[PDB]
Amino acid sequence: KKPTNILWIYMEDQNPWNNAWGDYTVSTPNIKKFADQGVRFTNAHQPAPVCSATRSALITGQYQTTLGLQNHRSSRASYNATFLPEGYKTVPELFVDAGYQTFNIGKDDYNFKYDRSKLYNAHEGKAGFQGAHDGTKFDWANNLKNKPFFGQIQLKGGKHHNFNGKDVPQVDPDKMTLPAYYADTPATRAEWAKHYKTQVLSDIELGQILKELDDNNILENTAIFWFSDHGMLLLRHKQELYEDGVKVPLIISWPAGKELLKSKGAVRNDLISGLDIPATSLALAGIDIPSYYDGKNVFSEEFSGRDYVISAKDRMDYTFDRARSVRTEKYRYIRQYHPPVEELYDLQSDPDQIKNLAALPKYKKELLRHRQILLDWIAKTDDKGAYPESERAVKEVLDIWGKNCVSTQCESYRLHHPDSVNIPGDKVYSPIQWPAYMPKPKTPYYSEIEHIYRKKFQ
Amino acid sequence: KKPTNILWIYMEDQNPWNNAWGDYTVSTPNIKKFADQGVRFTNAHQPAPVCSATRSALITGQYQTTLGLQNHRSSRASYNATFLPEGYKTVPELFVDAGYQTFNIGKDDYNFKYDRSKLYNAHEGKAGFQGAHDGTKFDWANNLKNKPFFGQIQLKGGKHHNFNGKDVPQVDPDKMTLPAYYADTPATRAEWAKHYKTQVLSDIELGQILKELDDNNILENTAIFWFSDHGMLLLRHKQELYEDGVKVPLIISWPAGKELLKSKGAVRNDLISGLDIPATSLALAGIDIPSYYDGKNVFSEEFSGRDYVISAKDRMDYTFDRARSVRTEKYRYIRQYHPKPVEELYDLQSDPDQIKNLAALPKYKKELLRHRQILLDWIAKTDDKGAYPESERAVKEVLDIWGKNCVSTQCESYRLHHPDSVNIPGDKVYSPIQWPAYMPKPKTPYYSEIEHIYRKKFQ
Ligand SMILES: [Ca+2]
Ligand SMILES: [Ca+2]
Ligand SMILES: [Cl-]
Ligand SMILES: [Cl-]
Ligand SMILES: [Cl-]
Ligand SMILES: [Cl-]
Ligand SMILES: [Cl-]
Ligand SMILES: [Cl-]
Ligand SMILES: [Cl-]
Return the HEC string of chain A: CCCCEEEEEEECCCCCCCHHHCCCCCCCHHHHHHHHCCEEECCEECCCCCHHHHHHHHHHCCCCCCCCCCCECCCCCCCCCCECCCCCCCHHHHHHHCCCEEEEEEECCCCCECCHHHHCCCCCEEECCCCCEEECCCCHHHHCCCCCEEEEEEECHHHCCCCCCCCCCCCCHHHCCCCCCCCCCHHHHHHHHHHHHHHHHHHHHHHHHHHHHHHCCCCCCEEEEEEECCCCCCEECCEECCHHHHECCEEEECHHHHHHHHCCCCEECCEEECCHHHHHHHHHCCCCCCCCCCCCCCCCCCCCCECCEEEEECCECCECCCEEEEECCCEEEEEECCCCEEEEEECCCCCCCCCCCCCCHHHHHHHHHHHHHHHHHHHHHCCHHHCCCCHHHHHHHHHHHHHHCCCHHHHHHHHHCCCCCCCCHHHCCCCCCCCCCCCCCCCCHHHHCCCCCCHHHC
Choose among B195, B277, B265: nearest CA to B233: B195
- Over the range A324-358, which residues count as b (16 or more CB within 10 Å of their CB) and which as e? bbbbbeebbbbbbeeeeebbbbebeebebbeebbb
Residues forming a β-bridge with A346: A331
* CA separation, residue B442 to residues B106, B134, B293, B452 (Å): 20, 15, 27, 16
- What are φ and ψ of residue B223, in 5° steps? -80, 120
Question: Residue A63 half-sphere exposure, CB side, CA atoms within 13 Å?
Answer: 20
Question: Residue B405 half-sphere exposure, CB side, CA atoms within 13 Å?
Answer: 14
Choose among B9, B1, B39: nearest CA to B211: B9
CA–CA separation, B223 vs B204, rounded Å?
A: 20
* Cα A147 to middle of ligand 1, angstroms: 30
Distance from CA of B332 to the nearest CA of A (A): 20
User: Which amino acid is it at A321?
Assistant: D
Question: For testing the chain B interface, which of A63, A86, A88 should be mutated: the one with the most B CBs within 10 Å?
Answer: A86
CA–CA separation, A64 vs A66, rounded Å?
A: 6
CA–CA separation, A191 vs B238, rounded Å?
A: 68
Residues 6+ apart with CB under 8 A from B159: B12, B13, B198
User: Which amino acid is it at A12?
Assistant: E
A437: alpha, beta or left? (left if phi > 0; alpha if psi -120 to 50): alpha
CA–CA separation, A83 vs A435, rounded Å?
A: 8
Angle at A119 between CA A117 and CA A124, to 5 degrees: 40
Residues 6+ apart with CB under 8 A from B419: none
Say if CB A290 and CB A88 are below 8 A apart: no
Question: For testing the chain A interface, which of B338, B383, B417 should be mutated: the one with the most A CBs within 10 Å?
Answer: B383
Question: Residue B364 half-sphere exposure, CB side, CA atoms within 13 Å?
Answer: 18
| Cβ within 8 Å, pair B86-A375 | yes
| Cβ within 8 Å, pair B340-A86 | no
For B86, the closest of A88, A292, A378 (CB atoms) is: A378
CA–CA separation, A281 vs A289, rounded Å?
A: 9
Residues of A in contact with B417 (CB under 8 A): none
- Cβ count within 10 A of residue B189: 18
Cis ω for the linkage preceding A73 (within 30 of 0): yes
- Which ligand is in closest contact with the Cα of A159? 1
Say if CB A295 and CB A273 are below 8 A apart: yes
CA–CA separation, B211 vs B209, rounded Å?
A: 5
Distance from CA of A11 to the nearest CA of B (A): 29
- What are φ and ψ of residue A253, in 5° steps? -135, 130
**Where does chain A break, by residue before each gap (C–N > 2.5 Å)?**
339
CA–CA separation, B359 vs B365, rounded Å?
A: 7
* Cα A130 to middle of ligand 6, angstroms: 12
* Cα A280 to middle of ligand 1, angstroms: 21
Residues 6+ apart with CB under 8 A from B253: B34, B37, B38, B39, B223, B224, B226, B261
- Cβ count within 10 A of residue B81: 20
Residues 6+ apart with CB under 8 A from B369: none
CA–CA separation, B386 vs B172, rounded Å?
A: 42
Radius of gyration, CA atoms only, chain B? 22
CA–CA separation, B299 vs B253, rounded Å?
A: 12
For B87, the closest of A86, A290, A375 (CB atoms) is: A375
| Cβ within 8 Å, pair A379-B292 | yes
Closest residue in A to B60 (Cα–Cα): A379
- Which ligand is in closest contact with the Cα of A124? 4
CA–CA separation, B148 vs B103, rounded Å?
A: 11
- Which ligand is in closest contact with the Cα of A129? 3
Choose among B76, B143, B157: nearest CA to B454: B76
Residues of A in contact with B341 (CB under 8 A): 436
CA–CA separation, B126 vs B427, rounded Å?
A: 21
| Cβ within 8 Å, pair A292-B380 | yes
For A379, the closest of B88, B340, B377 (CB atoms) is: B88
Question: For testing the chain A interface, which of B62, B381, B392 should be mutated: the one with the most A CBs within 10 Å?
Answer: B381
- What are φ and ψ of residue A117, in 5° steps? -65, -20
Question: For testing the chain B interface, which of A382, A383, A390, A430 should be mutated: the one with the most B CBs within 10 Å?
Answer: A382
Residues forming a β-bridge with B126: B134
| Cβ within 8 Å, pair A292-B381 | yes
Residues forming a β-bridge with A204: none
Residues 6+ apart with CB under 8 A from B211: none
* CA separation, residue B305 to residues B45, B229, B251, B260 (Å): 12, 21, 16, 17
* Cα A152 to middle of ligand 4, angstroms: 15
For B377, the closest of A87, A381, A383 (CB atoms) is: A87
For chain A, the residue count is 458
| Cβ within 8 Å, pair B380-A340 | no
| Cβ within 8 Å, pair A380-B292 | yes
Report the 3 state secondary structure along chain B: CCCCEEEEEEECCCCCCCHHHCCCCCCCHHHHHHHHHCEEEEEEECCCCCHHHHHHHHHHCCCCCCCCCCCECCCCCCCCCCCCCCCCCCHHHHHHHCCCEEEEEEECCCCCCCCHHHHCCCCCEEECHHHCEEECCCCHHHHCCCCCEEEEEEECHHHCCCCCCCCCCCCCHHHCCCCCCCCCCHHHHHHHHHHHHHHHHHHHHHHHHHHHHHHCCCCCCEEEEEEECCCCCCEECCEECCHHHHEEEEEEECHHHHHHHHHHCCEECCEEECCHHHHHHHHHCCCCCCCCCCCCCCCCCCCCCECCEEEEECCECCECCCEEEEECCCEEEEEECCCCCEEEEEECCCCCCCCCCCCCCHHHHHHHHHHHHHHHHHHHHHCCHHHCCCCHHHHHHHHHHHHHHCCCHHHHHHHHHCCCCCCCCHHHCCCCCCCCCCCCCCCCCHHHHCCCCCCHHHC
CA–CA separation, A332 vs A81, rounded Å?
A: 34
Ligand 4 ion: residues within 5 Å (CB): A 136-137
| Cβ within 8 Å, pair B85-A436 | no
Choose among B298, B275, B265, B202: nearest CA to B9: B202
* Cα B82 to middle of ligand 7, angstroms: 20
| Cβ within 8 Å, pair A88-B292 | no
Residues 6+ apart with CB under 8 A from B380: A85, A86, A87, A88, A89, A290, A292
Radius of gyration, CA atoms only, chain A? 22
Question: Residue A109 half-sphere exposure, CB side, CA atoms within 13 Å?
Answer: 21
- Over the range A269-304, which residues count as b (16 or more CB within 10 Å of their CB) and which as e? ebbbbbbbbbbbbbbbbebebbebbbbbbbbeeebe
CA–CA separation, B91 vs B57, rounded Å?
A: 10
Distance from CA of B84 to the nearest CA of A (A): 8
Residues forming a β-bridge with A134: A107, A126
Say if CB A440 and CB A434 are below 8 A apart: yes
CA–CA separation, A325 vs A368, rounded Å?
A: 13
For B376, the closest of A67, A87, A386 (CB atoms) is: A87
Closest residue in A to B386 (Cα–Cα): A85
Torsion of CA B295, B299, B301, B306, to 10 degrees: 50
A446: alpha, beta or left? (left if phi > 0; alpha if psi -120 to 50): alpha
Residues 6+ apart with CB under 8 A from A302: none
Residues forming a β-bridge with A225: A8, A252
Count residue pairs from A and B with Cβ separation < 8 A.
Answer: 58
| Cβ within 8 Å, pair A87-B437 | no
Q: Which long-range contacts (CB under 8 A, 24 or more apart) does B429-438 make?
A: B429/B79, B429/B396, B430/B79, B430/B80, B430/B393, B430/B396, B431/B79, B432/B78, B432/B79, B433/B78, B433/B79, B433/B80, B433/B81, B433/B113, B435/B81, B435/B83, B435/B113, B436/B83, B436/B86, B437/A340, B438/B86, B438/B87
CA–CA separation, A435 vs A86, rounded Å?
A: 9
Closest residue in A to B62 (Cα–Cα): A380
Task: Using an 8 Å CB-CB cutoff, list residues of chain A that contact chain B.
Answer: 66-67, 85-89, 290-292, 340, 372, 374-383, 386, 436
CA–CA separation, B245 vs B316, rounded Å?
A: 14
Provide the terminal-to-terminal Cα distance of chain B, rounded to the nearest Å.
57
For B381, the closest of A291, A376, A378 (CB atoms) is: A291
CA–CA separation, A198 vs A202, rounded Å?
A: 6
Pairing between β-strand A341-346 and β-strand A331-336 as defined by DSSP bridges: antiparallel
Residues forming a β-bridge with A273: A45
A178: alpha, beta or left? (left if phi > 0; alpha if psi -120 to 50): beta
For A67, the closest of B89, B379, B383 (CB atoms) is: B383
* A267 burial type by CB count under 10 A (0-12 exposed, 13-18 middle, 19+ buried): exposed
| Cβ within 8 Å, pair A380-B291 | yes
Say if CB B106 and CB B153 are below 8 A apart: yes
What domains can you pick out in chain A, each with its CATH number?
5-309 (3.40.720.10)
* Cα B297 to middle of ligand 5, angstroms: 26
For B437, the closest of A340, A374, A378 (CB atoms) is: A340
